[PDB]
Amino acid sequence: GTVPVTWRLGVDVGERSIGLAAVSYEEDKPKEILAAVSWIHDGGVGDERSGASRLALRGMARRARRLRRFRRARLRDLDMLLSELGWTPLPDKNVSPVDAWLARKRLAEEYVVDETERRRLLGYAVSHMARHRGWRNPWTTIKDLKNLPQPSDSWERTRESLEARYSVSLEPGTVGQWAGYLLQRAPGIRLNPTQQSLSNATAFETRLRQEDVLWELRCIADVQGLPEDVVSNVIDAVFCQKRPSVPAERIGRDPLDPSQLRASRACLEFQEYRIVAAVANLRIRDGSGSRPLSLEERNAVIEALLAQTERSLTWSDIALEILKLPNESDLTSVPEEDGPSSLAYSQFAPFDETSARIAEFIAKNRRKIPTFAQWWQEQDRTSRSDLVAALADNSIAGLLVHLPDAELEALEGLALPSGRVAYSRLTLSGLTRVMRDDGVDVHNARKTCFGVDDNWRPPLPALHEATGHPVVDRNLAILRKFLSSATMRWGPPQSIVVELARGASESRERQAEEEAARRAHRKANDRIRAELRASGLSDPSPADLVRARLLELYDCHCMYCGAPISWENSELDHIVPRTDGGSNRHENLAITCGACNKEKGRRPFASWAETSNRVQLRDVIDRVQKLKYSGNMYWTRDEFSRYKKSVVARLKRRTSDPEVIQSIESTGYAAVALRDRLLSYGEKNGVAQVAVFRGGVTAEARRWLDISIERLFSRVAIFAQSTSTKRLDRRHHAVDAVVLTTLTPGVAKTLADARSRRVSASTEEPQSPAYRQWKESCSGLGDLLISTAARDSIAVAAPLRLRPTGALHEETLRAFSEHTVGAAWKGAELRRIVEPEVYAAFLALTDPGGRFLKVSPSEDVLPADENRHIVLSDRVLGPRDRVKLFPDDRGSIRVRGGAAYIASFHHARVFRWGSSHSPSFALLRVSLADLAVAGLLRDGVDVFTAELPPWTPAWRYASIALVKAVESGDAKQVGWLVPGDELDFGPEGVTTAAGDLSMFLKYFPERHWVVTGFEDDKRINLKPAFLSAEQAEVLRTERSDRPDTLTEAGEILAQFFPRCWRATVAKVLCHPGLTVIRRTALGQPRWRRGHLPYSWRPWSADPWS
RNA sequence: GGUAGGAUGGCAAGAUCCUGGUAUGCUGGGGAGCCUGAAAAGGCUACCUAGCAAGACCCCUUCGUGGGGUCGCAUUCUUCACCCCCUCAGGGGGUUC
DNA sequence: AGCTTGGTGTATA
DNA sequence: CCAGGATCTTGCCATCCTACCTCT
DNA sequence: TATACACCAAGCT
Ligand SMILES: [Mg+2]
Ligand SMILES: [Mg+2]
Ligand SMILES: [Mg+2]
Ligand SMILES: [Mg+2]
Ligand SMILES: [Mg+2]
Ligand SMILES: [Mg+2]
Ligand SMILES: [Mg+2]
Ligand SMILES: [Mg+2]
Ligand SMILES: [Mg+2]
Ligand SMILES: [Mg+2]
Positions of chain B reached by protein Cβ under 7 A: 2-34, 44-54, 68-82, 92-97
SS (H, E, C) A141-208: CHHHHHHCCCCCHHHHHHHHHHHHHHCCCCCCCCHHHHHHHHHHHCCCCCCCCCCCCCCCCCCCCCCC
Spanning CA of A839 to C1' of B37, the rounded length in angstroms is 37
Give the bridge partners for A901, in sequence order. Answer: A892
Burial of A623 (0-12, 13-18, 19+ CB in 10 A): middle
The answer to whether A476 and A1081 are in contact (CB under 8 A) is no
Distance A600 CA to ligand 8 centre (A): 21
Which residue type does A459 have?
P
Q: Is A254 annotated as a binding residue?
A: no
Angle between helices A54-85 and A115-131 (to 10 degrees): 170
The answer to whether A573 and A597 are in contact (CB under 8 A) is yes
CB of A502 nearer than 7 A to strand D = yes
CB of A997 nearer than 7 A to strand C = yes
Q: Give, for A31, the enclosing helix (H) or strand (E).
A: strand A29-40
| Residue A35: closest CA among A51, A50, A18 | A18
Please report, to the nearest 10 degrees, the dihedral formed by the alpha carbons of residues A1077, A1080, A1081, A1084 taken in order: -70
Q: Is A41 annotated as a binding residue?
A: no
Q: How far is CA A724 from CA A477, A718, A795, in A?
A: 31, 7, 21
Q: Give, for A927, the enclosing helix (H) or strand (E).
A: strand A919-927
Distance A937 CA to ligand 9 centre (A): 18
Long-range contacts of A702-708 (CB under 8 A, 24+ apart): A702/A726, A702/A735, A702/A736, A702/A739, A704/A751, A704/A754, A704/A765, A704/A766, A704/A775, A705/A739, A705/A742, A705/A775, A705/A778, A705/A781, A705/A782, A706/A782, A707/A735, A707/A739, A707/A781, A707/A782, A707/A785
Q: Which residue is nearest to nucleotide B21 (CA to C1')?
A: A138
A896 alpha carbon, closest ligand: 9
- Please, where are the H alpha helices in A655-799? 665-685, 695-704, 709-712, 732-740, 745-759, 769-777, 781-790
CB of A55 nearer than 7 A to strand D = no
Spanning CA of A543 to C1' of B18, the rounded length in angstroms is 18
SS3 of residue A841 by DSSP:
helix
SS (H, E, C) A894-918: EECCEEEEECCEEEEEEEEEECCCC
CB of A617 nearer than 7 A to strand D = no
For residue A193, cis peptide bond before it (omega within 30 degrees of 0): no
Q: List the Cα angle A912/A916/A917 in 5-degree steps.
A: 120
Give the bridge partners for A1102, in sequence order. Answer: none
Distance A565 CA to ligand 4 centre (A): 20
Q: Which residue is nearest to nucleotide B54 (CA to C1')?
A: A932
Q: Is A733 annotated as a binding residue?
A: yes
Q: Which residue is nearest to nucleotide E3 (CA to C1')?
A: A658
The answer to whether A701 and A751 are in contact (CB under 8 A) is yes
Q: What is the resolution of this structure in A?
A: 2.2
Burial of A763 (0-12, 13-18, 19+ CB in 10 A): exposed
CB of A669 nearer than 7 A to strand D = yes
Positions of chain C reached by protein Cβ under 7 A: 3-6, 10-13
Extract the runs of DSSP E, i.e. beta strands, from A756-834.
794-797, 817-820, 825-826
Q: Which nucleotide is nearest to A14 (CA to C1')?
A: E1
Q: How far is CA A449 from CA A19, A273, A298, A562, in A?
A: 43, 14, 20, 60
Distance A634 CA to ligand 10 centre (A): 51
DSSP for residue A320: I
Alpha-carbon gap, residue A759 to A88, rounded angstroms: 76
Distance A13 CA to ligand 1 centre (A): 6
Q: Give, for A689, the enclosing helix (H) or strand (E).
A: strand A689-694
CB of A522 nearer than 7 A to strand B = yes
Q: Which nucleotide is nearest to A1055 (CA to C1')?
A: C5
CB of A865 nearer than 7 A to strand D = no
Distance A690 CA to ligand 1 centre (A): 17
SS3 of residue A440 by DSSP:
coil
Alpha-carbon gap, residue A355 to A308, rounded angstroms: 9
Sign, Cα dihedral of A786, A788, A792, A797: negative
Alpha-carbon gap, residue A740 to A690, rounded angstroms: 12
Structural domains for chain A = 7-47+468-502+665-797 (3.30.420.10), 62-238 (no CATH), 256-429 (no CATH), 517-651 (no CATH), 979-1077 (no CATH)
Experimental technique used? cryo-EM
> String of b and e for A889-909 (b: at least 16 CB within 10 Å)?
bebbbbbeeebbbbbebbbbb
Helices then strands (H, E): number in chain A? 41, 29
Positions of chain D reached by protein Cβ under 7 A: 1-23
Total residues found in chain A within this entry: 1105
User: What does R_g of chain A's alpha carbons equal in angstroms?
Assistant: 35
Alpha-carbon gap, residue A303 to A2, rounded angstroms: 64
Q: How far is CA A28 from CA A8, A23, A494, A602, A698, in A?
A: 10, 11, 11, 56, 18
Considering only residues 780-809 of chain A, list those whose CB is below 7 Å from strand B: 798-809
